[model samples]
Target: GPSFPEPKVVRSQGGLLSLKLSATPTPLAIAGQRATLLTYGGSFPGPTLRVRPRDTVRLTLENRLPEPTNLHWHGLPISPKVDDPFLEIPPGESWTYEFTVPKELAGTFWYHPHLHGRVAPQLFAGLLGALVVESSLDAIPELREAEEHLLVLKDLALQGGRPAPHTPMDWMNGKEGDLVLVNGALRPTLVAQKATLRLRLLNASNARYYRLALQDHPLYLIAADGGFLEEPLEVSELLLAPGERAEVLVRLRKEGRFLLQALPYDRGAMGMMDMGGMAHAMPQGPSRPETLLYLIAPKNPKPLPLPKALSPFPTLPAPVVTRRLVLTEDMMAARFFINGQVFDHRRVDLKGQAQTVEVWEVENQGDMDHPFHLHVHPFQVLSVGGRPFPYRAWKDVVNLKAGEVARLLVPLREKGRTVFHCHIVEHEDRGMMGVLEVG
Candidate 1:
C-alpha cells in the first residue's frame, strides 16, 4: 500500500475563512484506475476547511456541472437562511454562504450537495468536504503534540471510467459502493512517530455503515458527532453510519504495523409484499471484513500520556414538550414518509420555541435501518431501544434499527426553518424528510 495522501487544508485567517469551490469534472486515478469524476476544486473528497471557535466562514460554490446543486453544512447550528438546501444554483451560476461558527461548537463536520432528488447522485459522484472546528482541547500538550489525521471515509462504484448508475434495488436499499476508500485512496498506509495519534473520522458514504476496529489495539473514543465526550471510552469496535462522525485516540505502544479493519454488520433486510399471497424478503448481501488502513509506528516513538478528562458534560433541562415521529416506507410505491406524510417544503410539520428544551421520541417502523439526522441543532440521546445510553454526548445522527425507538433531548437554539430527515440520501430524496420551525 502507498502512503496516505492528505487532503488540502484551508485554515481561517483573522477569524474568517474564505474559499471558492468549483464543482466540475476532473480526472483522477483511484487505486490504479483512471476515472473522470465530479469534484470540488478539482480534487476528490474536496479540501478540508479548518476554522476556530467563534470564527466566520465565507464560502462560494460555483456550479459548473450540468445540473442544479446546493451545499449544506451537515451538523452546524447556523441559521437556515445561510445553510439552506432549498436554494438551488443552476449550471454556470455561483452562490456564497456566510455564517459565523457557534462559539461552543467544535467537532467533525462536513459539507456536500443537499438538493432534493440529487443529493444521492451528486454525493455518489464525489462532491463532499470535511469541516473541522478547533477548540480548547487542542491546547492540551498530549493532543497538541500528537500526530493527527483527518480521514474521509467513502466508497465508489465505477463503470466505464465513470460512476455507475443506480439500479432499482440500489434506490430501495440505498447504494453501497464496492470499492471503499479512505481519504480518496484505497487502503492507504500511515506512518506515526508519536506514541499517541488522533484519528478524526467522517462517514461520507451515501449509505454504507462502517464498523471500525483496529487489530490488536484499543480505540479510545474521545468525541462523538457534536463535540468531545466527558472522558475517553475504550471500545473494541465503533460503528458509524452515514453522516456520522467520531474522533478516537490510539496508542502506538509498539513498533509494528497494525491494520484498521471494518467488521461485518447486518443493517437488516427489506421485506417486500408479494402479490401472490406470499411475502418475499430482499436480504442485503452479507458484508465481509475488510482492511481500511495500516499504521506503522516508529521504533523510538515519542511517548505522550492520554488526557484523563475532556470537556465537561452539561445538564439538559426537563422537556416541556414531547413529540413522537414514526418512520415508514412503501416499497411498492417507492416512497417514504414521516408521520404518514411526504415532505412538503410549504408545510411545517413541527414547531418549537427558541431556547426551550423538548423530548423527541423517534420510532423506526420500517424494515430497514434509518440513520436520523437533524439540521441546525444537535440533540443528546437519552435512550435507545428502551435502554438508556451509557454516557451523555451530543449527536446529530443516530441509527435506528427495525422496530427500535430512541428518545432525544433537543435544545432549540436557532430561530428559523430547517429540516430533519434520514441520513440515507436515497430515502431522504424520496420523501423521508420533514420541515421544522423554531421561533
Candidate 2:
C-alpha cells in the first residue's frame, strides 16, 4: 500500500520567506494513470508555505497557463491590497504578493486561484496549496509530543485521462469528483506509532462536504479555521465544508488499523424547472460514504493524554451593527445571487468600519447548501438554524443548508475592500458573491 504523501513544506527563514511559484500544466499520476493538470509550482496541491507570527512572506506567482489567474490567501487577516482577488496575472505574466503575517493569526489556511470566471475550472483542474501558521500552542506537552499531519482533501472526476468538463448539473448543484484524494493520492496509508496524532484537515474541494469520522475512535477537535480552541472537544464526527479546516487529536491507544471515513450527508435535493418548462433532476447517482485515509499502528505504543487547556477563548463585544443577507438562485437564468444581485467587481454591496464588531444574519433561500466564506477576516459563528453554536470557535467559512439561517460575529478589523461569497467556486463564478468595504 502507498503511504501517505505529505506536501513539501516551505518554511520562512529569519522572519522572511521569498519564493516564486509558477502556475503551469504538469503531468502527474492520478489513480494509477498519468494526467496533465494545472498546478502551482509544478505540484498538485502546491507546497505548504509555513510561517510563524509576525513573519513576512514575499511570494511571486508566474502565470504559465493559457488564462489569467490570481491567488487568494483564504482566512488570513492580511490587507486586501496584498490578498487581492481582483489582481490578475495573464499568460506569461507574473505578480508579486508581499504581506506580513499578523502576530495573532495562526491556523490552517490555504491558497487558490480566485479569478472570478475561472475559479471553478482552474481549481477543479488542480491549482491549490496550503498555508500553515506556526502556533505557540504546539509547545504544550501533549500537542508537542503528537505527530502532526497536514491533509489536503480534494476530489477529481477524470475523463480520458483528463479532468472532465463541467456539465449543466455541475454548474447548478456544484461539482463533486468521483475520486477523492488526500495529498494527491488515493486511499493512502499512514504508518504511525501509538501516540496522539494531530491531524490538520483542510477541505480543499470546490464543493464536496466531508463528514469526517474515525471508525472506532472519537475525534478530539482542538482548532477550527481561524485558530486553536480554548479546550479540546470530543466529537463523533466533524463536518468540513469546502474551504473549511479543522484540527483533531486522535489518541491511538491500541495498535491496530483505523479508517478515517466520510459519512454520507445530503446537502439538499437539486431539482429545478428549466427555461422550456421542463423539470430536471440531479444527474449524479446516489451518495455514499467515502474512506479518506488508512492508519496502521502495528506495535504497542504508550498512551498519551489529550491537552486539557489550550489557547484562550475570547468573549466578543456586543456588535455595533446588524445586517441581513439572503442567498438565492435563479435556476431559469442559471445564476446565483446575494441579496438578489449578482456579483459586480465595480460595485460595493456592503460597508463597515474597521475595528468594529457586526452581526451578519445570512439566510440560504435556495434549495441547495452554500458554504459562505469571507476574505481577510475570520468570523465566529454565533448561531445556525435559529440555535446558538455550542462552542466558541472562529471560522472563515460556514455551511448553510437550504433555507437555513446562520448568524456570524464578524470583527472587521482590517480596513480595505474584499469580497465574501460561496465557497462553491461554481456558484461564485456564476454570481452568489458580494463586495465589502471596511473603512
Candidate 3:
C-alpha cells in the first residue's frame, strides 16, 4: 500500500489543544515534479484539527506569506471578537486566537483564509482544511467501531504551474475549476474489509457545489452543518453546496467496487461565461461527472450491520425577533449589497438580545444567486421560495437563488458583533455583508 501523509493532528497537553500554524510557501509533488504553493503548516489543505467539546483550543498563526491573511473557524458558535472573519494579519506578523468549544459544539467544521479581496486566490492556491470537535455520538457502539475518514473536497484551476488568472469576470461569475481533488488526491481510493464507515465531508471549494452519490448504495446521514440530525435520513444523494458539511454512515455489504462521485451540475448562465464583461463568453457545455473517491472492498469480506438508530437531535424553538435582509447587485456597476447597503465594519446593521431567537428573511433580488452565511451561531432553514425546506436541518450557510427568499431561524446565544454575508468570496469582498451585534 502506498503511504500518504494525513494532516497531522495537533496534540493537546494539560487539557489545552495548542498549535502554532504558519502559512507559507510549501512544495508538493505534482505530475512528477515538486510544485511550490502557498499552504498552512507546509501541507496542502492544512492540518486537521481535532478537539473535544468544552475545551479551549488556542492557535497562534504566524503569517509567513507575502500578503496579509486571517483564518475563520467556519461553523462553530463562538464570540466574534475571536471568530472574526475580517481580522487580517499582515506578512511577518502573528496573532494568537483562543476560543472555547461549547459543549453543544461538536461536529465537522473547517478553517480557511477569510481576508477580504484575496480569499478566492488564496483558497484556490490550497489554504484550507477540516476542524472537528469530538462528539459524544462516538460512544455509540456501531459508530465507535466504524472506521472514520475526513474528506476535504476542493477544486483548482492551474495554468503554467500557478493559480489560474482570476479576473473581475471570474469573480462575478464565481470561479469554477477545471481540476478537482479529494484530500489533495486526484481520484483517491480507500480499501476496507467490510466494516461500517463514517465519512465526515467538508465542502472546502471556492465555488464548486457537489451533488454526491455512492454508486448503487444509500448513505445514512447522521449529522449536518450544526450537528447531529434528529434521526438518520436515508438518502441516495447528498447535495453539498460550498461551505457545507455532512456526516454519513455506510455499511458495506459485499466485495464490490463503489465510487463516490459527483454528479454534473448546471449553474445556468453563471456556469461557464462570466457576465462581468460586456459580451459573455461561450458556454462551457455540460460538465462531466467527477469520481471523487473509490471504495474498494476486499474479496469475501464479512459485512458489518448498520445501526438501527443514531444520536438524538432536539428541535430548535421559535424566534422572538425577526429581520428581513435583501441581497441586491448591479452587474454593470460591479457592486453588491445586503439590505440595500454595502458592508461597513463600523456600522452595525442589526442588533439582537443575547439568548433570544431570531428569524431572518433573506431575499435575493439579483439575477444571480448567492450563498448566505452568518457567524456566531448556526441557523435552521424554515422555508425557501415560500415553502418549507424539505429536509429542515441546521446550517450556517444556505444558498438563495435569484429572486428566491429563504427564512432562517437563528439562535442568538453568542455575544459581540458578528457578520452575515454571502459565502462567495468575491461577493463578500465586494460588500454583500452586514454586521449583527448580539448583546
Model 3 Cα shift for residue 128 (angstroms): 0.9
The list of candidate 2 runs beyond 4 A from truth reads 269-279, 282-286
Cα lDDT for residue 207, model 1?
90
Query: Can you write out model 3's per-residue Cα lDDT over 1-439, one digit (the tens) per residue?
Result: 3432246666456668888899997878643446676888988778898888878889999999999999888988888889887698999999999988888767889898888778878887888978888877788777788878888888877777776778766767667787787877777778864467888998888777788998878888988887877667789898787788999988776788899999986542243355677565454444579998889866775545666665554466667878999999866455789878988888999999988788899999887667888987888888888988666556899888778899988888778988888877767877888989998
**CA lDDT, every model vs. true structure:** 0.89, 0.89, 0.80
Per-candidate RMSD, Å: 2.1, 2.2, 2.8
Measured on C-alpha atoms, candidate 2 has an lDDT of 0.89
Residue 146, candidate 1: alpha-carbon lDDT: 78
User: lDDT score of model 1?
Assistant: 0.89
Q: What is the lDDT of residue 184 in candidate 1?
A: 88
TM-score of 2: 0.96
lDDT of 2 by residue, 240-286 (tens): 99999999998886788889998888876365557676666552433
Candidate 1, residues 311-418, lDDT tens digits: the string is 988887778899999999887566889999989999999999998999999999998889999999899998988999876778999999889999999999889999
Q: Can you give the TM-score per candidate against the true fold?
A: 0.96, 0.96, 0.92
